[PDB]
């Protein structure tokens, strides 16, 4: 995350490859289910031998004896509908919920986050020289309407996508942050309204970020789970 600061986000998880390395983020939606981005995977039938999800630590590379660290093998991937840019990962085991590891709520089907809503992005991805890129960083964004977004994006943003306000300072989620959550605090709950996806340009001054809009796809998520 560029332009952010060290923080905690107990529903954000780290996806780990065969070499034990962080490659993408994810969002804890059920005790054994992680919602993430399709662009984190080479195919929908990717060989996921050796892949795990790590939870409960602020560090990208924690000491393996770390008390709050949970490490769970990936059981399987399920690709979302065409145009969703989503993947669900089932874990080989159900994680244990505590103060460091918490489920984020799913939105109601078709729900539109109102403009001006404040949301948080989080991840262990690149900071482009704006911070320590080996701890969890967070940034606060502000939702804008798709109509307002599509002025600068010239109509490219789909109904299946949502946007946040372009920031004057370079701020946003880039490489290694894909699949993590856009979490919005509304109606007395943190709710997973978006998933971080690749954009044409990342953390670019005055350019609105675009996320996949989770409320469009919640029928599929519930069905799969």
């Amino acid at each position: 995350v560029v332009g952010g600061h060290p923080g905690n986000s107990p529903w954000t998880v780290s996806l780990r490859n065969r070499q034990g390395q962080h490659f993408c983020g994810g969002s804890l939606v059920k005790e054994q289910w992680i919602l993430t981005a399709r662009q984190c995977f080479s195919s929908c039938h990717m060989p996921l031998t050796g892949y795990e999800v790590w939870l409960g630590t602020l560090f990208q590379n924690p000491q393996h004896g770390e008390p709050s660290l949970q490490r769970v093998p990936v059981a399987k991937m399920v690709c979302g509908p065409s145009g969703s840019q989503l993947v669900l990962l089932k874990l080989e085991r159900s994680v244990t919920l505590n103060q460091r590891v918490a489920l984020i709520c799913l939105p109601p089907e078709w729900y539109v986050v109102p403009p001006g809503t404040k949301c948080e992005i989080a991840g262990w991805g690149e900071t482009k020289g704006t911070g320590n890129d080996t701890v969890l960083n967070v940034a606060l964004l502000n939702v804008i309407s798709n109509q307002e977004c599509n002025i600068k994006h010239r109509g490219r943003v789909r109904e299946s996508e949502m946007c946040t306000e372009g920031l004057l300072a370079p701020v946003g989620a880039c490489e290694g942050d894909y699949g993590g959550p856009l979490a919005c605090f509304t109606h007395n709950s943190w709710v997973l309204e978006g998933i971080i996806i690749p954009n044409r340009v990342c953390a670019r001054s005055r350019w609105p970020a675009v996320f996949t809009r989770v409320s469009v796809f919640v029928d599929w998520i519930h069905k799969v789970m």
Binding site: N8, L103, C105, S189, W190
Partner: peptide, 4 residues
């Protein structure tokens, strides 16, 4: 869900 959704408590921090």
């Amino acid at each position: 869900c959704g408590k921090r």
